[PDB]
Design a protein around this ligand. Structure first.
Ligand SMILES: *[C@@H]1O[C@H](CO)[C@@H](O[C@@H]2O[C@H](CO)[C@@H](O)[C@H](O)[C@H]2NC(C)=O)[C@H](O)[C@H]1NC(C)=O
Ligand SMILES: *[C@@H]1O[C@H](CO)[C@@H](O[C@@H]2O[C@H](CO)[C@@H](O)[C@H](O)[C@H]2NC(C)=O)[C@H](O)[C@H]1NC(C)=O
Ligand code: FY5
Lengths: 107, 563, 118, 563, 107, 118
């Protein structure tokens, strides 16, 4: 199948920082790369469809810049309400594997 | 110069027990029925069989047969092994090249032919083409003369002939035998076998031998066969053919009774007191083999040009059906349609490469046991002569025509990537066609096999089933298919910069998927790489499949039972 | 648009499992495909399989023969029947909603947890 | 009962001038070379040629040949026209059925065979299968006896034989001729022609005739040919075959000189004073023709079962490749992939229907001039015997296997629409295969023609090019293609209720087109009707193409040059 | 090609009437049927895409109910500002033929 | 999003025709396909042919060899060059805008009229 290695399994950032979450794919996804955001105790809210689009209900800070296999998410100047567990998903094939899910931290 | 032999048991099943005799410098004849050993003893004395199948000895002038015996003697196969597509002057310069010494002069190669073609009476038909079904040529009575001159180059003293009368008319064959009778006195020992002989043939021999159901019935000179069988209990009736009366004994106007007469034959007893006195260069090899099939290739328009006429017409029809492939929603179906149609042509026209070796099988067998070439010199030459040009051309004829009519990707390199890719899949499907058909004399079997195999390659090529959606204990079969790798490359070659949803720039975002709005989305969904290795991965797959399948063709031509 | 599970938060091992996702705000025979998600402790998400709007269905090939999804169209439900349950797949389960054309898991359940012990 | 003839000029090119003689009740022999008229005069006296090509008369007992002459006389073709796949008792009940009277009893049909099979010595091989390459049977010397019994049913007084010795061994053919010598005295006039005869054959004749390059050289009884040619200037030397010494005259140990001897032959002058005295039911016809090829069909597993083994295996492989076709974005490619693969099978396996008529061509020619059937009775029977069952079966073997493995549309009718549609395209591509191959004895030509024609139908079937996107002076060619109408119907049969964008109910609205999110959007975009006429339009197209192509096959079998 | 016969070439209606404009197609369009509205002296404003959808900038009165070949437009209780020239278009094939264009009237 | 023509409102017959549609609010190299429309007097609309965003183009097959569309990408223009103009096609011309995914003529020009007389 298609496994989605979020090779940075965690981070340690501070507020107002541009953090860049990678999501390395094991095959070409062709911008079929979702992003979710699981606050603890919740279901994953959808963040970015299409690996470049955005979902209504977010600031214009989350922005996916992906191409080919090297999809990534850019969070310019993150907030307090944006620590979570970011899961990338392929929806190219049928076994919709997700990423491992990075997890942001505060130093 | 004499031949001699003693106590020959030949099995695979002994259709012989033991044969005893010597053969003088003269005219040695073997007669009998087709089920008898009259065709098997001649392959024994000319060493055309398995030596482990052989039991006894072959002693020549007080010496056994060396490795040099095949290189200084001539056996002539029953069918026309000549190149009827060439002429006699051309074909005897071939057999001069691979048999005369490298030190010997081209002037000597000019002269020693002319010592022989002048002898054969073939000075009229020197530059006259010999003859095909589709090219009118010399009569078949001198096709038989043509092959004998192919086996008289280095002056072999010992001549052998598979069935010199069968295949020719009555007075047609007499002009062959009087020529051999001219050879019967020039110090040339002709040893042959005739089914259904005649008294006009019988009256000119020197020695004679009869075989029937693997049993020996006569040895000695040819006149006294009528003298001996009178004492067996018969009498040759008034106005009967003697050579047909010699088969009147055989099938009951029993076999064990007639052979016991021969054990007590005085013709055997002199031989019993005679046998126990006795028993008691590569670049040059590629310089001319490549030329000979090349003139076969020019001298057959109905197989060379007639496969270009199919290529040019179907080059133009596909040019007219498709014609300026649009970048709309139907554009994916057309571009993937033609590229699947080209690669399968390339493959399903490579079935015609089985016409190469299977027809040339019996000529390959006789010419290697004669020793005209090393097997690789045949194999680096004929592929240079027929595999190279007949598949470089339709991979350019398709390529020049259907590229700019259809408007395939208007770049310089992609014209030549498609040119090279069709060239490889032409070779690769031909190499498998050579790999299967090597060492098979049947056509209808191997033609059926590749027809099965290409169909089970057509499925896995990617158009008829999506290769990612096959159960994973079958998705290893998608590697064993030549129409995958070419059609993968042609889909890689063409679908890169394309777009197919007009009005919809898809390369930044594809809103509303299940859409296939760019060439990559079609190309990934087929399970094909987008990195530039993914193009040439197919070629090095195909390049290895050429070398492997030629090696299997090289080993099958090496490990063949030549005997 | 509005999904919710209701089922047993515990099971004996190696028998079965039943969950039920009742959909309001929308009818499951109208448009979308309807799929289940589990999330393990030691959080890794694992999509489980969708039932289409017309009863057809495709399941995650790691879960062969163990998951099945039925539906009761007359009240907008679709059922999770997970059999021969090992104690290892004691994950948090979800029902979710797939657009087809947008392609993403647009709507989710609330979150039911299943603990497989004895 | 005698034959007689006078002043016969036969052209297309006169390879004859005029031949004069009578043939007594006895053993009439025609000898000479193959280029001579020895094979052409025998087709004249047995009326196997064009009567406009004939010039002179054929007078029998003071009566010309009626239309009843072929219905009471027997000519036997040189090759084995028997059914080696059947047995002798079965094959002689066939030739009893179509030749004896309808009023005659089945007991009489049991007895009159037994008056003949007892006569031929074939009582051992009565129920023994006669023999094939792939089924061991009776020796070929009684295959020749088998055909003669096929031409002795209604007791014909006048017998004709194409080459009774060629194809058999030496003592093999004598047992044929002694049987004919037994027929030579029972009031049966045997008139034949032998290439390369023998004195064992020559010593038993009653009359004799020599032809050479269309010139007559002998007439009269057979003893006096050796007596006459002594006076021509020759002498038969000591221990020579007389029948071979008669060809010693021919080719120069000239043609105009030897014929002038025959004009002044006293054997001609008695004949000159002899010739100028002279010259001065359908249901039953379908009851047994359908049975005979039916037992050909059972008595060949390597052509009947071997085309089921291919069908069952490729039924199962396609069952394994596809296996539960998903309703996702790849689902269109798979469902259109298999249905294109089934129809092209159906078509490219119908090339094997050319094996039917081309092999049975020479048996069709001899059996109709004998008058065993009306041509439609052959044509309503063999299609009942081979076209019907061998194409009903793989249209069920494919249909039962690949339907429920693949999960094609789970309704009752659509299982049988697909069953019937594959049945028609099996017939329709076979009918074209019959329409092309009717009246052609060559295989390699017509097999190549349909291979060209099906490829130029494969393109227009709708997968390799979208049919709406062809230039409008080619979109009339999309009607002349059998793989269109079946594959149109199978795409109509299956893509109705389907959906292919999961999660996306498309039947109310398709947001974001270029999508193909339902089965109709694929089906319209191929240019295929959605009304239920659009299904059966294909069938009545195919039903008309069966009837037309069978009629072209019926006319080609009717307007054939039988002579 | 595909010709679009608006067989009712005109009408004569009154205000507050449900008028039903047909648009018979010469082939299956599969809901690829636009509707326009040309006021005199203007370019055709788009009214209904998809043969069932609607375009923002209109009341919920214009409503296309089409299926197969027999596409039609329903204008429940028309206004004064809705007399015009309604053109139906296929956008299935490439030669995007339009309809003849009906024209509403007031009795 | 914002289109406008500017050209000669008259021509001599059987020579040529030039129109120019300058697009603001959007760049014609970005997304859409760009097509021309004429409407005859005795009003019947007749789509004429689109240029794609990447310069490729497809023209209405009644107008073969007579219409051509070029583009000057550096200022967002695309040109109507209509040659051998008969006096019969004296229609009102338009430039318009096609989505591709929505499928409809979403945006139109303002309307230029061409009268072909002498
Ligand atoms: C299709 O749209 C995408 C973005 O929606 C274009 O991609 C980028 O556009 C910006 C803005 O002009 C450029 O600076 C980048 O160089 C573009 N990237 C690429 C890879 O092209 C894209 O150009 C559009 N397609 C076409 C043919 O213009
Ligand atoms: C797909 O959606 C369409 C509408 O968006 C459904 O079509 C109609 O829906 C109404 C509302 O229930 C029904 O009264 C009609 O009978 C439906 N018509 C048809 C032809 O189905 C449609 O049902 C939806 N598809 C499915 C499979 O339910
Ligand atoms: C027609 C074709 C050559 C031969 C075809 C074939 C031949 C035998 C066959 O089955 S078979 O029983 O005859 O073994 C299946 C097929 C399926 C497709 C295949 C090609 C498509 C394009 C092409 O050139």
């Amino acid at each position: 199948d298609i496994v989605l290695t979020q090779s940075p399994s965690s981070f340690s950032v501070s507020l107002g920082d541009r953090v860049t979450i990678s999501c390395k794919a094991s095959g070409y996804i062709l911008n079929r790369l979702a992003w979710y955001q699981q606050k603890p105790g919740n279901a994953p809210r959808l963040l970015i469809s299409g690996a470049t689009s955005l979902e209504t209900g977010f600031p214009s800070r989350f922005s996916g810049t992906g191409s080919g296999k090297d999809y990534t998410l850019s969070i310019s100047s993150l907030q307090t309400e944006d620590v979570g567990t970011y899961y990338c998903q392929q929806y190219w094939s049928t076994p919709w594997t997700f990423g491992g899910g990075t997890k942001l931290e505060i130093r | 110069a004499v031949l001699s032999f003693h106590n020959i048991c030949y099995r695979v099943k002994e259709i012989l027990s033991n044969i005893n005799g010597i053969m003088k410098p003269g005219l040695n004849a073997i007669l009998g029925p087709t089920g008898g050993g009259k065709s098997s003893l001649l392959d024994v004395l000319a060493a055309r069989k398995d030596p482990s199948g052989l039991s006894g000895d072959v002693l020549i002038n007080g010496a056994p047969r060396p490795a040099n015996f095949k290189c200084n003697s001539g056996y002539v196969v029953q069918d026309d092994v000549v190149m009827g597509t060439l002429t006699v002057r051309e074909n005897l310069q071939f057999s001069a090249a691979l048999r005369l010494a490298t030190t010997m002069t081209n002037h000597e190669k000019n002269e020693r032919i002319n010592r022989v073609i002048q002898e054969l009476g073939l000075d009229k038909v020197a530059d006259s083409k010999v003859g095909t079904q589709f090219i009118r040529g010399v009569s078949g009575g001198e096709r038989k003369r043509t092959s004998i001159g192919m086996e008289l180059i280095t002056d072999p003293s010992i001549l052998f002939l598979d069935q010199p009368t069968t295949g020719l008319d009555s007075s047609t064959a007499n002009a062959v035998l009087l020529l051999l009778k001219r050879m019967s006195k020039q110090g040339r020992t002709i040893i042959f076998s005739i089914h259904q002989p005649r008294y006009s043939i019988f009256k000119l021999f020197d020695s004679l031998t009869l075989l029937a159901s693997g049993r020996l019935m006569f040895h000695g000179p040819a006149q006294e066969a009528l003298g001996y069988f009178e004492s067996a209990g018969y009498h040759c009736e008034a106005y009967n053919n003697p050579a047909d009366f010699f088969l009147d004994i055989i099938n009951g106007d029993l076999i064990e009774k007639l052979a016991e007469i021969y054990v007590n034959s005085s013709f055997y007893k002199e031989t019993k007191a005679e046998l126990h006195q006795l028993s008691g260069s590569f670049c040059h090899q590629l310089r001319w083999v490549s030329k000979r099939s090349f003139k076969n290739l020019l001298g057959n328009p109905q197989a060379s040009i007639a496969q270009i006429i199919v290529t040019v017409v179907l080059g133009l029809v596909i040019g007219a059906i498709y014609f300026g492939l649009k970048n709309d929603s139907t554009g994916i179906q057309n571009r993937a349609g033609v590229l699947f149609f080209l690669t399968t042509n390339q493959c399903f026209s490579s079935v015609s490469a089985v016409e190469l070796f299977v027809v040339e099988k019996k000529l390959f067998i006789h010419e290697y046991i004669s020793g005209y070439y090393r097997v690789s010199s045949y194999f680096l030459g004929k592929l240079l002569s027929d595999l190279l040009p007949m598949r470089m051309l339709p991979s350019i004829i398709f390529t020049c025509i259907v590229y700019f009519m259809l408007g395939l990707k208007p770049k310089a390199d992609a014209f030549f990537v498609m040119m090279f890719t069709l060239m490889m899949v032409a070779y690769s499907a031909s190499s498998m066609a050579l790999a299967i058909a090597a060492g098979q004399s049947v056509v209808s079997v191997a033609t059926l096999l590749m027809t099965i195999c290409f169909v089970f390659m057509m499925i896995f090529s990617g158009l008829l089933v999506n290769l990612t959606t096959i159960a994973s204990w079958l998705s290893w079969l998608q590697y064993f298919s030549i129409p995958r790798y070419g059609f993968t490359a042609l889909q890689h070659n063409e679908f890169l910069g394309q777009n197919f949803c007009p009005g919809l720039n898809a390369t930044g975002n594809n809103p509303c998927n299940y859409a296939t709005c760019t060439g990559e989305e079609y190309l990934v969904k087929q399970g094909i790489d987008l990195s530039p290795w993914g193009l040439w991965k197919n070629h090095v797959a195909l390049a290895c499949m050429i070398v492997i399948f030629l090696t299997i063709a090289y080993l099958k031509l090496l490990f063949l039972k030549k005997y | 648009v509005q999904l919710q599970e209701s089922g047993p938060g515990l099971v004996k091992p190696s028998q079965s499992l039943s969950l039920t996702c009742t959909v309001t705000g929308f009818s499951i025979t109208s448009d979308y495909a309807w799929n289940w998600i589990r999330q393990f402790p030691g959080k890794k998400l694992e999509w489980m399989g969708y039932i289409n709007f017309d009863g057809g269905t495709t399941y995650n090939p790691s879960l062969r023969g163990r998951i099945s999804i039925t539906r009761d169209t007359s009240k907008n439900q679709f059922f999770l029947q997970l059999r021969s349950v090992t104690p290892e797949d004691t994950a948090t389960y979800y029902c979710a909603t797939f657009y087809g054309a947008k392609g993403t898991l647009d709507y989710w359940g609330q979150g039911t947890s299943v603990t497989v012990s004895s």
